[PDB]
Design a protein around this ligand. Sequence first.
Ligand SMILES: *Cc1c(COP(=O)(O)O)cnc(C)c1O
Ligand SMILES: *Cc1c(COP(=O)(O)O)cnc(C)c1O
Ligand SMILES: O=C(O)CCC(=O)C(=O)O
Ligand SMILES: O=C(O)CCC(=O)C(=O)O
Lengths: 431, 429
Amino acid sequence: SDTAEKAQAIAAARNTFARDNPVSAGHHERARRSMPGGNTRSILFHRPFPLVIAQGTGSRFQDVDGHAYVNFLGEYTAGLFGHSHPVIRAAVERALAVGLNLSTQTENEALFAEAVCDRFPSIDLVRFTNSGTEANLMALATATAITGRKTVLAFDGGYHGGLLNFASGHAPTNAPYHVVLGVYNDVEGTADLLKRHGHDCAAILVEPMLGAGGCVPAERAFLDLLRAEASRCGALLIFDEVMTSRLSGGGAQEMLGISADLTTLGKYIGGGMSFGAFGGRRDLMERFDPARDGAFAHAGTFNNNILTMSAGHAALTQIYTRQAASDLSASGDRFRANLNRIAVENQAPLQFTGLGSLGTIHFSRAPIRSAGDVRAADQQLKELFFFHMLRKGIYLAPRGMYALSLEIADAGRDAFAEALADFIGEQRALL
Amino acid sequence: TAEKAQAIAAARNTFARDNPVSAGHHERARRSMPGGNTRSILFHRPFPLVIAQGTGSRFQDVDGHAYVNFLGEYTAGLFGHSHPVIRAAVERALAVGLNLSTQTENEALFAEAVCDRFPSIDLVRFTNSGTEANLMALATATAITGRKTVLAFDGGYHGGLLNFASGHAPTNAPYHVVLGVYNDVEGTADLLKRHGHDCAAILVEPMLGAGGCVPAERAFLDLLRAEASRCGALLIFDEVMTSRLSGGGAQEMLGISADLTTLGKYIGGGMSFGAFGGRRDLMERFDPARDGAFAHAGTFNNNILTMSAGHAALTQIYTRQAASDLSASGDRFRANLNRIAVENQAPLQFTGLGSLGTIHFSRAPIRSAGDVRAADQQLKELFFFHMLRKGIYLAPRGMYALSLEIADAGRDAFAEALADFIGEQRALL
Ligand SMILES: *Cc1c(COP(=O)(O)O)cnc(C)c1O
Ligand SMILES: *Cc1c(COP(=O)(O)O)cnc(C)c1O
Ligand SMILES: O=C(O)CCC(=O)C(=O)O
Ligand SMILES: O=C(O)CCC(=O)C(=O)O
């Protein structure tokens, strides 16, 4: 629960942040004249104002006030290649040479689709979208249209895009699919919901690890229930792998040996360009074959844009190969283990949860298994941690999430670990 | 008729014979994408072209055939295939840095250009597509009003998940959509009488785009503006296509203001792009710092490429003057095409506004989706294949969208090809 002591510490941290970043402060007031709250991505806003960045190369960027940071946020998993990857740049140059807005299919989209199908074991066919939000919306459109049903089972804490946000339960702006919310990792509770709703469930939509919800891994028993019951009731199991796809060459599904009926993809796979994708079992995806009678339509001006097609193919085949995925996940696992080792050795009431190269801090000693556990953790200390890391020249998400890019090296990881130890020492009274 | 069907069979066969390399590509593409397809509109029978390369207004297919691109990415491809200013903006974006995970000045600069240009947009937010923009506009309307009913129009197209071009579709996002008839004052008035109490939004294009370049009549839009205000529904103008028609879109030309406006396609400089904006008090609901703030997320919303290319698109390339000039150019072009039709007593017309136009094989008034559908669809398909054989590429549905790279030579070629079609297909006309 909130204390005056922690609130005063946060005020001090915010005040120091404010005083040290007057140019950013000024830009926020300016931006408010053209965008609501000077904002166009809700997650980028935090009090007193967000940092405005001038320039970045590799793993580093500099704000408009001259401070340099190592970027541990990695564009919420999308920024896997850093700020200036030469192979990505080469792909962009290649795309420009091919030509922009060609108003037609090129070979590049087919090559990218083949790359996706090759490495993701449950994706027989794929279609590209302009975001993970579109990918998940299309997956639900597919499920409802195929099954003829209206009910969607999702989970509290789950995030499937701007129109499918359940991070704080139901939101009035969510697309009006008939969504029933379960508790993440709750086998008995979810079993009960499927007994009530299963016969009219078009889809079960779930991340194999809550991403925005707190890097909360799904337990095998939970995913086993979803797979078993989706098949039983005739619902399509949709694994939202927008974040988890990086965890191995074939994402979480390769790791688990569990196959979803449809899989959604996004973020890094398009090489840092606008990107989403939905794919899955052949017989389901074939409903979109435009030559079929009663074919489902899937539109989108920029679905096949040359930049995404080129950068994405390079991302999957030239940079983040299946082996590179295994390697980075192993690297992330060692990193996260070291962070937790530092916590345990200092008897700190904090932990890092996640998988592979993905992690989020939680100020709690309890097992983090559902949205409730994440919310029950100390949110004041979380904010205090964010500002501390900033002062140490380390940028991660305000919510305490990192997503290791391929540009993070020993020096970056060491600085992060040292800064964590410093936080534990300096904030001992509040811990 | 059977004669038109045999002519279509012959045209498809000639296209197939002309393009065996594209045919090869299609068979391979089918192994990884449904129907070898990732945008439904790009498929046509017997198979679509695969393009190898393009520069300016021209492109080349994989069989080596060259074409002038009159399609212009369904209005998004306003700058041609290799605009130097767009290229410069891309290079500048790369110099700033990709996936910086933070705001830069560039999004603010782009937002400022958008708000400056469009008279009813006080505040704006960027999305990754026009579909996302329209979904967010509907999200805004339903959440603010607490109402469920959305009035839209048969023939209306508002994105993949909001596609009413052929009435309701089972894949459409499950908003409670009631469909009216475009330009139908009496019928729409009746619907607003019945549904006005629970109407969250009226969603309408100032000209049906995908529906056939069918201009809205003043009386129709006046009805919508008055009734939206009366019943407390948000009037949403989908200007994804129409925004190009002047510096400030259709709303500037009409002197009618929608409560929310959605944008897309060309405004992002050819990069992934969408935007929703409108009245300040409505948009302020998305200020993340306000109590009970609505959330609008999206990883690539503020992506540096779109922010840079978009700012260049509005402030350097497609200025207010450029918009006026291109629309005047397009009006002259469309008039010339219709003149050619009239001179040859051809049962066809081109409908549209400014640099946007669509052929319809009918001389009846084209005022709604019904009129578009009642026109000869067989001749429409024959026209597409004919133009291809003449090295002119436009939409299979017979729509052109003039880019800034279209010049005298291209326009002259289009006109001659139309005249040739009329003469060669006189027996079917
Ligand atoms: C980021 C994310 C999305 C949304 O993708 P966008 O490109 O931001 O629309 C969906 N699902 C998950 C699990 C994500 O992490
Ligand atoms: C193209 C279009 C859209 C959709 O924009 P996308 O980027 O393809 O999702 C919406 N409305 C209209 C009028 C359009 O023309
Ligand atoms: O490219 C797409 O998929 C949609 C294009 C479009 O909006 C149109 O039909 O005009
Ligand atoms: O950047 C955005 O708006 C979405 C990113 C996201 O899904 C997240 O919160 O991790």
